[PDB]
Design a protein around this ligand. Structure first.
Ligand SMILES: Nc1ncnc2c1ncn2[C@@H]1O[C@H](COP(=O)(O)OP(=O)(O)O)[C@@H](O)[C@H]1O
Lengths: 53, 186
C-alpha cells in the first residue's frame, strides 16, 4: 500500500550485503593510480649492474 | 728481526716467514660482493668479502676475480685482500720484515711499478723484492740448471734456466691455465 521502513530497511540491508559493489568500487578504482617511483629496489638493480660487467 | 714472503702466484695465496717449512695459511684471492637487498636489518653490511670467509658466505655474494691471465686486474681490490691477509692471518705490521713478491715473468711493467709504489707507500716496509717463478722452482728443486713448466691458476710458463743465468729470449709464456680450461669444461 506504501513505501515503508520495512522496504527501505530491506534495501539498506541488501546494500550492506552486496559485497561486489563496495569491494569493486574500492579496489578496482584504487587499482589504477598505483605506482610512481625510481625504486630503491631498482637502486639495488643498478648497483648490481655496476658490479656486474 | 725476521723476514716475510708473500706468494702472489695466483690461486690460493701463500705467505710465510723465512725458514718455516710451509706457509701459515693460504687464500684463493677470490673477491666477492653482495647481490641482493640487505633485508636483515640486524646484519652489519660489509660490502666486500674475500677468502674462506667468502668461500663460506658465497651464495648471495658474487665474485670478482682480481687477476686475469696472471695480470692483476684491479689494484684497490688487491689492497683490500693484502691488508686483510696481513692483519687477519699474519697479525703483522708493514714495518716488520722485508717482503718478497712473486711474479709472472715477461709481463707488463705496470704490475711492477704500481705494486712497489703501493706497498712502499700504502704499507711501509723495510725491504722489497719481486722474483721470477722459475728461480724459486730451481732453488727448491735444487738443480742449478733446468727448464720449468708450471701452469698455475695463471699464465703458463716455459723457462729454461741454465745454472746462474737467464735466457730471456728462450722463454715462452702462455695463457692456458686451468681456469680457462675449466670454463671450457662447462
Ligand atoms: N687438487 C687439485 N688438483 C688439481 N688442480 C688443482 C687442485 N687444487 C688446485 N688446483 C689448481 O691449481 C691452481 C692453483 O693456483 P696456482 O697453481 O698456485 O697458480 P699460480 O701458478 O698462478 O700460483 C689452480 O689452477 C687450481 O684450480
Amino acid at each position: 500500500x506504501x513505501x515503508x521502513x520495512x522496504x527501505x530497511x530491506x534495501x539498506x540491508x541488501x546494500x550492506x550485503x552486496x559485497x561486489x559493489x563496495y569491494x569493486x568500487x574500492x579496489x578496482x578504482x584504487x587499482x589504477x593510480x598505483x605506482x610512481x617511483x625510481x625504486x630503491x629496489x631498482x637502486x639495488x638493480x643498478x648497483x648490481x649492474x655496476x658490479x656486474x660487467x | 728481526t725476521t723476514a716475510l714472503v708473500c706468494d702472489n702466484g695466483s690461486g690460493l695465496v701463500k705467505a710465510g716467514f723465512a725458514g718455516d717449512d710451509a706457509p701459515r695459511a693460504v687464500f684463493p684471492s677470490i673477491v666477492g660482493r653482495p647481490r641482493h637487498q640487505g633485508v636483515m636489518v640486524g646484519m652489519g653490511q660489509k660490502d666486500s668479502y674475500v677468502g674462506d670467509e667468502a668461500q663460506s658466505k658465497r651464495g648471495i655474494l658474487t665474485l670478482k676475480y682480481p687477476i686475469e691471465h696472471g695480470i692483476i686486474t684491479n689494484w684497490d681490490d688487491m689492497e683490500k685482500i693484502w691488508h686483510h691477509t696481513f692483519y687477519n692471518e699474519l697479525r703483522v705490521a708493514p714495518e716488520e720484515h722485508p717482503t718478497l713478491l712473486t711474479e709472472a715473468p715477461l709481463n707488463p711493467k705496470a704490475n711492477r711499478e704500481k705494486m712497489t709504489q703501493i706497498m712502499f707507500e700504502t704499507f711501509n716496509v723495510p725491504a722489497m723484492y719481486v722474483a721470477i717463478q722459475a728461480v724459486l722452482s730451481l732453488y727448491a728443486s735444487g738443480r742449478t740448471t733446468g727448464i720449468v713448466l708450471d701452469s698455475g691458476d695463471g699464465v703458463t710458463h716455459n723457462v729454461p734456466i741454465y745454472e746462474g743465468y737467464a735466457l730471456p729470449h728462450a722463454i715462452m709464456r702462455l695463457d692456458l691455465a686451468g681456469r680457462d680450461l675449466t670454463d671450457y669444461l662447462m
